[PDB]
Protein backbone atom coordinates (compact mmCIF):
# COMPACT_ATOMS: atom_id res chain seq x y z
CA UNK A 1 0.00 0.00 0.00
CA UNK A 2 2.17 2.84 -1.32
CA UNK A 3 0.74 4.20 -4.59
CA UNK A 4 -2.66 4.75 -2.94
CA UNK A 5 -0.94 6.61 -0.10
CA UNK A 6 0.81 8.71 -2.75
CA UNK A 7 -2.49 9.47 -4.51
CA UNK A 8 -4.21 10.51 -1.27
CA UNK A 9 -1.38 12.94 -0.48
CA UNK A 10 -1.83 14.58 -3.89
CA UNK A 11 -5.57 15.03 -3.27
CA UNK A 12 -6.47 17.92 -0.98
CA UNK A 13 -7.87 16.90 2.44
CA UNK A 14 -10.87 18.38 4.24
CA UNK A 15 -8.64 19.72 7.06
CA UNK A 16 -5.41 21.66 6.69
CA UNK A 17 -3.64 19.56 9.35
CA UNK A 18 -4.48 16.41 7.36
CA UNK A 19 -1.95 17.40 4.67
CA UNK A 20 1.54 15.86 4.81
CA UNK A 21 4.49 16.03 2.42
CA UNK A 22 5.72 12.96 0.53
CA UNK A 23 8.68 12.53 -1.80
CA UNK A 24 7.77 13.39 -5.39
CA UNK A 25 9.91 10.86 -7.29
CA UNK A 26 9.25 7.79 -5.14
CA UNK A 27 6.55 7.58 -2.49
CA UNK A 28 8.60 7.71 0.69
CA UNK A 29 6.84 9.66 3.43
CA UNK A 30 9.46 10.04 6.16
CA UNK A 31 12.66 12.10 5.83
CA UNK A 32 11.43 14.50 3.13
CA UNK A 33 13.37 17.69 2.37
CA UNK A 34 10.92 20.58 2.05
CA UNK A 35 13.64 22.66 0.37
CA UNK A 36 13.49 20.17 -2.51
CA UNK A 37 10.35 18.07 -1.94
CA UNK A 38 12.59 14.99 -2.16
CA UNK A 39 13.36 12.42 0.51
CA UNK A 40 16.89 11.84 1.76
CA UNK A 41 17.65 8.80 -0.43
CA UNK A 42 16.23 10.16 -3.69
CA UNK A 43 18.19 13.37 -3.17
CA UNK A 44 21.43 11.33 -3.18
CA UNK A 45 21.02 9.79 -6.66
CA UNK A 46 20.06 13.10 -8.27
CA UNK A 47 22.83 14.97 -6.46
CA UNK A 48 25.33 12.32 -7.60
CA UNK A 49 24.18 12.86 -11.20
CA UNK A 50 24.19 16.66 -11.39
CA UNK A 51 20.46 17.25 -11.80
CA UNK A 52 20.42 19.85 -9.01
CA UNK A 53 22.57 22.88 -9.98
CA UNK A 54 25.13 23.99 -7.41
CA UNK A 55 24.81 21.11 -4.91
CA UNK A 56 28.42 19.93 -4.64
CA UNK A 57 30.06 17.74 -2.02
CA UNK A 58 31.28 19.48 1.13
CA UNK A 59 34.74 19.53 2.71
CA UNK A 60 34.22 22.41 5.21
Amino acid sequence: AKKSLKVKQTRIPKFAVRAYTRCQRCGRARAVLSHFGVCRLCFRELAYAGAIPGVKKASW
Partner: peptide, 19 residues
Amino acid sequence: NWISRWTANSHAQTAKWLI
Protein backbone atom coordinates in the same frame (compact mmCIF):
# COMPACT_ATOMS: atom_id res chain seq x y z
CA ASN B 1 29.40 20.71 -14.52
CA TRP B 2 25.76 20.05 -13.63
CA ILE B 3 23.46 18.31 -16.09
CA SER B 4 20.61 20.73 -15.28
CA ARG B 5 21.34 24.46 -14.96
CA TRP B 6 18.48 26.65 -13.74
CA THR B 7 17.59 28.80 -10.74
CA ALA B 8 14.05 28.61 -9.39
CA ASN B 9 12.10 31.31 -7.57
CA SER B 10 10.91 29.46 -4.46
CA HIS B 11 11.01 26.06 -2.75
CA ALA B 12 7.65 25.02 -4.21
CA GLN B 13 8.65 25.59 -7.83
CA THR B 14 12.09 24.17 -6.97
CA ALA B 15 10.53 20.71 -6.46
CA LYS B 16 8.49 20.67 -9.66
CA TRP B 17 11.49 21.75 -11.76
CA LEU B 18 13.52 18.86 -10.28
CA ILE B 19 10.99 16.07 -10.79
